[PDB]
């Protein structure tokens, strides 16, 4: 269990880390842990159906890469349990 980068609220980041640790302990594949993370992280984030548009990102794998101007202070990309996992808000 380790994190590599996160621009986010500390309590939200720790909550995401706990949920990711639970999912990684539970789920198996890339799609399976991706789906569990994408679903279960949408609870503790209050989904505002207002004019703002945001989403979840799922990357649970060995080695890909990206570098984008994502949502400001709303993206956590960790690398835990020999699996990098990126999750960002949709710009």
């Amino acid at each position: 269990y380790k994190i590599i980068t996160s621009y986010m609220p500390e309590s939200f980041e720790q909550d995401a880390v706990q949920i990711a640790l639970i999912a990684v302990d539970k789920y198996r594949q890339l799609k399976d842990i991706a789906f569990y993370i994408k679903h279960e992280y949408d609870k503790k984030y209050p989904g505002s159906g207002k004019a703002t548009e945001g989403v979840y990102h799922c990357i649970v794998g060995k080695s890909f890469a990206s570098a984008v101007s994502h949502e400001t202070r709303q993206f956590i990309h960790m690398k835990v349990d020999t699996y990098h996992v990126i999750l960002w808000k949709s710009k």
């Binding site: 994408k38 990357i59 060995k62 890469a65 710009k91």
Partner: protein, 82 residues
């Protein structure tokens, strides 16, 4: 270039599937390749997109309005959405 599945603006998708050769010949690393491809796609198509290129990474998340495909090029793939 190749593909796995597709539900997208196939005009923009099949335009990008041959325009990405410019960044593949241009850049020299998968991070920089994805950067130089997505910058060209954002200048070309619109100011809203999302692309994750490379391999050895999985994704199951909700898509955007009118773009969702896993379009590859010689096992160095792209996951494209708007």
């Amino acid at each position: 270039a190749v593909i796995k599945n597709a539900d997208m603006s196939e005009e923009m998708q099949a335009d990008a599937v041959d325009c990405a050769t410019q960044a593949l010949e241009k850049y020299n690393i998968e991070k920089d390749i994805a950067a130089y491809i997505k910058k060209e796609f954002d200048r070309k198509h619109n100011p809203t997109w999302h692309c994750i290129v490379g391999r050895n990474f999985g994704s199951y998340v909700t898509h955007e309005t009118k773009h969702f495909i896993y379009f590859y090029l010689g096992q160095v793939a792209i996951l494209l959405f708007k």
